[PDB]
Amino acid sequence: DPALWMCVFAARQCYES
Amino acid sequence: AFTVTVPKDLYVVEYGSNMTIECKFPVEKQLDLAALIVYWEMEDKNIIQFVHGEEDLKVQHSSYRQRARLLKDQLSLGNAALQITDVKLQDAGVYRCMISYGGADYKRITVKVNAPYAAALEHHHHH
Ligand SMILES: *CC(=O)Nc1ccc(NC(=O)C*)cc1
């Protein structure tokens, strides 16, 4: 749950830069 | 259990307007920012990461920058209200809010961005 959501958010933020 | 609900799961908005889509969750008496985490995504883009009273502007996908924010005082009512301003066509799609405040839950919301009647009008003058 919120740990997973923060992981995915982190992963997409990295990719976007 | 902990439960997020949506007053409405389909918004239809006009190109260039402002929109506010909503997720409700249970808050008793006073809110406790220490426990609260709010996320908003749509498709494959990060809109909102609200963790312990602070909203990390860096994780936000670039197309939503200065243009989508979370309504704070609404949070004390258990309403996580995402507000996009001047909506584009690329704002249409499936949004999702994830909320942690004790338990954790989520719900999905579909948002469509259609052109104004005046644009259909120009196009019917080609008819
Ligand atoms: C749990 C978690 O935070 N996972 C995760 C994966 C990748 C990244 N960073 C990049 O992809 C650049 C951060 C966190």
Author numbering:
A (entry chain C): 1 to 17
B (entry chain A): 18 to 144
What do the authors report?
To target disease-causing proteins that are inaccessible to small-molecule or antibody therapies, we are exploring the use of a nature-inspired drug modality that exploits the intrinsically favorable properties of synthetically constrained α-helical polypeptides (Helicons). Here, we report a rapid, high-throughput screening platform utilizing phage display that enables an unbiased mapping of the α-helical interactome of a given protein without any prior knowledge of its structure or known binding partners. Biochemical and structural experiments demonstrate diverse functional impacts by the Helicons which bind these sites, including inhibition of protein–protein interactions, inhibition of enzymatic activity, induced conformational rearrangement, and induced dimerization.
We selected the ECD of the transmembrane protein PD-L1, which binds to the ECD of Programmed cell death protein 1 (PD-1) to suppress T cell function, and which has not, to our knowledge, been shown to bind α-helices. The asymmetric unit of the FP28132 / PD-L1 cocrystal structure contains a symmetric dimer of two FP28132 / PD-L1 complexes. We have also structurally characterized two other Helicons, FP28135 and FP28136 derived from the same PD-L1-binding phage cluster, and observed a similar assembly. This revealed an extensive series of contacts between both the two Helicon protomers and the two PD-L1 protomers. Taken together, these findings demonstrate the ability to discover multiple α-helix binding sites to a relatively small ECD that was not previously known to have any, as well as the ability of Helicons to induce protein dimerization.
